[PDB]
């Protein structure tokens, strides 16, 4: 579970992303594929080369989902209910792959926002991403 200080830090850090959403989500996706090549098997139908239009398109979807998760932070299981059924039941994604994308999202956020990425904010974003991962791995038959 989170904290009122965690929520403040996540809203503020992700607020300085804004228009740069699709570049950041795509960069996080690209960082994931090159670092952990096992994750590439969930996307065979995607052109995974540098500057790919599908990776850039999906990166936007990933980032918009994380924005919706920050919005409804107190009611995350309901807001990402469709996304949970998609990742858990349909695609059957391994829970470890979420820890790997979450890490890449933190590396991306560190590489782009050095003023926002304080140790306190690092702690908050890790907890947020871990909470999102928990919800997307939840499978209720």
């Amino acid at each position: 579970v989170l904290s009122p200080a965690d929520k403040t830090n996540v809203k503020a850090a992700w607020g300085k992303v804004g228009a740069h959403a699709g570049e950041y989500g795509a960069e996080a996706l690209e960082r994931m594929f090159l670092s952990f090549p096992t994750t590439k098997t969930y996307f065979p139908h995607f052109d995974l080369s540098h500057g790919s239009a599908q990776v850039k398109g999906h990166g936007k979807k990933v980032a918009d989902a994380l924005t919706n998760a920050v919005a409804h932070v107190d009611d995350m299981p309901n807001a990402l209910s469709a996304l949970s059924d998609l990742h858990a039941h349909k695609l059957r994604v391994d829970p470890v792959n979420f820890k790997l994308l979450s890490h890449c999202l933190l590396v991306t956020l560190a590489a782009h926002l050095p003023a926002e990425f304080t140790p306190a904010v690092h702690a908050s974003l890790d907890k947020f991403l871990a909470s999102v991962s928990t919800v997307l791995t939840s499978k209720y038959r």
Binding site: L34, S35, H103, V107, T108, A111, P119, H122, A123, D126
Partner: protein, 146 residues
């Protein structure tokens, strides 16, 4: 760890620009803030209550310098990581009893610190290279559990 020749060059080139006094202390510092349970292994270090106190702690910075020195020692001996971390594996496993999952966490926090310090320069293929390194160091430090 099977590192590509182009990846070996990218690592050493980036590592020569690393602030040896601050980076290591920031890695250990963040490990203690992001993952609080790691603080039980450092009861003798002092004030670790607030994030600023962990980062501003002299004992954390000084010990972090030695951790960074162990990473540098592993970068010069990529072919034999088991032997380079053999003594440190005995300390972390048989004496201190640190769970091997924490080794990976510190490696991933180091990657986050290198990203914070270099920005755009810590390009995606450079991260991929460092992920191979920090995973090799973790697995080598976890040998006494195998």
């Amino acid at each position: 760890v099977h590192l590509t020749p182009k990846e070996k060059s990218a690592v050493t080139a980036l590592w020569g620009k690393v602030n040896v006094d601050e980076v290591g202390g920031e890695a250990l510092g963040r490990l203690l803030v992001v993952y609080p349970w790691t603080q039980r292994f450092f009861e003798s270090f002092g004030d670790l209550s607030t994030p600023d106190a962990v980062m501003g702690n002299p004992k954390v910075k000084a010990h972090g310098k030695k951790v960074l020195g162990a990473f540098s020692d592993g970068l010069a001996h990529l072919d034999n990581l088991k032997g380079t971390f053999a003594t440190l594996s005995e300390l972390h496993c048989d004496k201190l009893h640190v769970d091997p999952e924490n080794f990976r966490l510190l490696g991933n926090v180091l990657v986050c610190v290198l990203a914070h310090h270099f920005g755009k320069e810590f390009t995606p293929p450079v991260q991929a290279a460092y992920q191979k390194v920090v995973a090799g160091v973790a697995n080598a430090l976890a040998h006494k559990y195998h």
